[PDB]
């Protein structure tokens, strides 16, 4: 993804996506989080 070509120049060198942004794995949302006794944990809530 960092080697995605944003523009190609006649010289031969391109402007890549890594030249304007930082690319990496993350999460599709950052709303909520949970802790169990102050320790970061992954949690699910089961609704009946």
């Amino acid at each position: 993804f960092g080697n995605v070509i944003l523009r190609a120049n006649t010289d031969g060198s391109n402007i890549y996506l890594k030249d304007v942004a930082k690319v990496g794995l993350g999460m599709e949302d950052y709303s909520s989080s949970t802790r169990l006794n102050g320790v970061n944990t992954t949690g699910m809530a089961v609704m009946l």
Binding site: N3, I5, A8, N14
Partner: protein
């Protein structure tokens, strides 16, 4: 090759359409045939 394709104007989606219509059929529109609609399909000649 990403670099080679970017050097020319090929956009990897023109490739998608070209291949999808050449090596497989393409469903483009719909026409009436004595009262019932039937598909229009472009598939390219068998010799190629």
């Amino acid at each position: 090759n990403r670099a080679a394709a970017a050097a020319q104007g090929v956009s990897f989606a023109d490739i998608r359409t070209a291949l999808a219509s050449a090596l497989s059929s393409s469903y483009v529109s719909d026409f009436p045939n004595q009262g019932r609609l039937q598909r229009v399909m472009v598939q390219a000649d068998g010799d190629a």
